[PDB]
Design a binder for these strands. Structure first.
Length: 65
DNA sequence: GCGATCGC
DNA sequence: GCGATCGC
């Protein structure tokens, strides 16, 4: 699933298969992802988040140490 | 300031 | 250990 978001006001897209960590941050769903060997950070407003990312968020929470 | 991650 | 990164 492709996640579309804005990074410094510019459109960006990341596949869920590259996403690492996902968490709720206020009104946003924050995430980190693998950007060809480097950590990338992105955020999408929760109301705009696709289902696949919201499902990953749920899983992340249930299993957080 | 909000939550967490994660660079250094 | 501490502080920048992400949007606002």
């Amino acid at each position: 699933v492709k996640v579309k978001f804005k990074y410094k006001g510019e459109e960006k897209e990341v596949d869920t298969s590259k996403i690492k960590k996902v968490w709720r941050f206020g009104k946003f769903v924050s995430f980190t992802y693998d950007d060809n060997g480097k950590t990338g950070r992105g955020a999408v407003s929760e109301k705009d988040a696709p289902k696949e990312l919201l499902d990953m968020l749920a899983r992340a929470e249930r299993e957080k140490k």
